[PDB]
Amino acid sequence: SGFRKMAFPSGKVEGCMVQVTCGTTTLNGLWLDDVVYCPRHVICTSEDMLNPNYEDLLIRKSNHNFLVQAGNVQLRVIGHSMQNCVLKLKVDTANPKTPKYKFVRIQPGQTFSVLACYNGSPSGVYQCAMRPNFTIKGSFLNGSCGSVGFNIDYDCVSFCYMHHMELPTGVHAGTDLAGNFYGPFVDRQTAQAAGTDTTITVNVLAWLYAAVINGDRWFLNRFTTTLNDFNLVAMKYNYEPLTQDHVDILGPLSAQTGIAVLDMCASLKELLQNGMNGRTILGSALLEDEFTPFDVVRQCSGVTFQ
Amino acid sequence: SGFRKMAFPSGKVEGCMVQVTCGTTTLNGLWLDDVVYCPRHVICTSEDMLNPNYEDLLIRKSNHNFLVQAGNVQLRVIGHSMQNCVLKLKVDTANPKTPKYKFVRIQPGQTFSVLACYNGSPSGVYQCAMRPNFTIKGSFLNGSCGSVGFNIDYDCVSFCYMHHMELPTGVHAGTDLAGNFYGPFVDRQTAQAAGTDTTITVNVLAWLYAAVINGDRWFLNRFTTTLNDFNLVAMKYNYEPLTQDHVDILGPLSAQTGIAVLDMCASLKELLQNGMNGRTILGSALLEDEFTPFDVVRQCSGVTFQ
Numbered sequence A, B: 001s002g003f004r005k006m007a008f009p010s011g012k013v014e015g016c017m018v019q020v021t022c023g024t025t026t027l028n029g030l031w032l033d034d035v036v037y038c039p040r041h042v043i044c045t046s047e048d049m050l051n052p053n054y055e056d057l058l059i060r061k062s063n064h065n066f067l068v069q070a071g072n073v074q075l076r077v078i079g080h081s082m083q084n085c086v087l088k089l090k091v092d093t094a095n096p097k098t099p100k101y102k103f104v105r106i107q108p109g110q111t112f113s114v115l116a117c118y119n120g121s122p123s124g125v126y127q128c129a130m131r132p133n134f135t136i137k138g139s140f141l142n143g144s145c146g147s148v149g150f151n152i153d154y155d156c157v158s159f160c161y162m163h164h165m166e167l168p169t170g171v172h173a174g175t176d177l178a179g180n181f182y183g184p185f186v187d188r189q190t191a192q193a194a195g196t197d198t199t200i201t202v203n204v205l206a207w208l209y210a211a212v213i214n215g216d217r218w219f220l221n222r223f224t225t226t227l228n229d230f231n232l233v234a235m236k237y238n239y240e241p242l243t244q245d246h247v248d249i250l251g252p253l254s255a256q257t258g259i260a261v262l263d264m265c266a267s268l269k270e271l272l273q274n275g276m277n278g279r280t281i282l283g284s285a286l287l288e289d290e291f292t293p294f295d296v297v298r299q300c301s302g303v304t305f306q
């Protein structure tokens, strides 16, 4: 037993990280087959930086302007193209460590592992959620651009995030691996703010089920609630609406614990209305919302990756 | 910015995990050069299990009794020996993925990454501390024995933990990689209890410094305290004594933030005495004690591994 914020094993992604240097800018790239993916603002400088036109900026570049450093081995760029806000550098060598992979654009509320990197070298791995306001609460210092987020599904790495920038509230914004920002953000220094966030209700419920699976039983009650009456309480506390689809997804966990989803909603209602009164759940004094129903099942049943 | 429970990149350890099967028991082993390390209770059965004599049990074993499965490749055991509570299986093949490594026995309060594994396949990675009572609050299901904990220091993996068992409170006990249990535990089903735990004071202080580095400034105060007067308050709240050595270790963080260590102690004092009053620090409503001073510096300055 026990329940931890668990990341996927990072080895499959570690073997893909490279350093991309252009001009005075150095950041991380992702090397899959013979392509290196990195944020397009690597072609920017200290003054391009306020309102650049990346199409103009890129037409002015030559392949030899791109230093791609794969460990102590230099990779030669033989072509480049821009796809939305990512740059794709064609190199003459296919990454022999390329895992089976997919690029996926995730929905808010879904979680993923982030491999934080500097100068092409991994620093650490941690678990994140895509917040409802399309930011992530990451841990990113200067130089971390191009670090990626990912899930692993049996043997396949599903890349879902590449880091671009930090918002003045200390949260982070980035793109999918096809260069489309999550949320309304743009890779331009103009005023941008995250937008009001909300708590991921279906994930809180999953985590309460995790608690029950692990022996925290104390927040349960005899009551039930309707979805409607629950959602009226959730809105007051800035929680995302719970949909019948969320209820269906929580089915397996409800069946394993014997606690109907709507009964667990009645428990969440009382926790919102009464607080936790100096008690903890799974070692937290807050209601945790960065575990999906799938995360809970994976960790409570022991799914591996090969 | 941002601050997360960060694990080390796990790839160097993923390449060392194997499956060890003997009799009806299957667990994980660690393959370094031509040796596989695993818990000695792999030689146990459903009834050996209450009071085994592992020396007798092992003399009765043959090399061919040990199935070591490295992916879809079987490793032949050519020798075996017991070292305390770990079994060392000599195999005919050296692991080509063997990283630079050391075996280290850590002190309580020190943190490490755990690569949770089942059937030789990694499931997830998370960060732990060795509690003052020599347990760890892990996430371990049946089959996880032989998963290891580790730190990485530039290019060197320092293995510090191998998982053996779960205590009735849902916490975990194990050994160093030389098979010596942390704490008073034994690999025998007899009554054993963790012992009263305490909070790791020097780590809480490190995490408050992390908060200041990241812009949470609110818990600070104008006051100071003596070490003596601080430790009198810490004892009341079941905190470990803070030593002058801890104060010295916190020096760099104190110098970077401009907050004297004893001034941060005065802040911790008021947090213990007053609670947090519905506020959070670094996204937690509890005082966090599983970041060491080194963890904070590493994450707030961006140290990598190559």
Ligand SMILES: *[C@](O)(C(=O)NCCCCCC)[C@H](C[C@@H]1CCNC1=O)NC(=O)[C@@H]1[C@@H]2[C@H](CN1C(=O)[C@@H](NC(=O)NC(C)(C)C)C(C)(C)C)C2(C)C
Pocket (backbone or CB within 6 Å): A025, A026, A027, A041, A044, A049, A140, A141, A142, A143, A144, A145, A146, A164, A165, A166, A167, A168, A172, A187, A188, A189, A190, A191, A192, A193, B001
């Ligand atoms: C990222 O570019 C990086 O790691 N680069 C390494 C090389 C030095 C700079 C190259 C451009 C970096 C990651 C940031 C740094 C701190 N935390 C992070 O996550 N991204 C950026 O530097 C992006 C980049 C340029 C600015 N920027 C920022 O993140 C800005 N933030 C904003 O300007 N935000 C608003 C636009 C919303 C106001 C800071 C101030 C944090 C540097 C672009 C946005 C093109």
Ligand SMILES: *[C@](O)(C(=O)NCCCCCC)[C@H](C[C@@H]1CCNC1=O)NC(=O)[C@@H]1[C@@H]2[C@H](CN1C(=O)[C@@H](NC(=O)NC(C)(C)C)C(C)(C)C)C2(C)C
Pocket (backbone or CB within 6 Å): A001, B025, B026, B027, B041, B044, B049, B140, B141, B142, B143, B144, B145, B146, B164, B165, B166, B167, B168, B172, B187, B188, B189, B190, B191, B192, B193
């Ligand atoms: C570990 O052996 C394992 O993963 N093995 C896989 C093969 C099946 C059993 C082989 C022995 C397993 C990990 C445990 C399981 C649940 N959580 C874990 O961390 N360890 C054990 O099964 C150890 C092993 C035998 C019992 N045991 C336990 O952990 C016991 N706990 C205790 O008996 N604890 C006291 C001795 C303190 C009472 C449980 C009940 C959790 C199975 C030994 C201790 C030799």
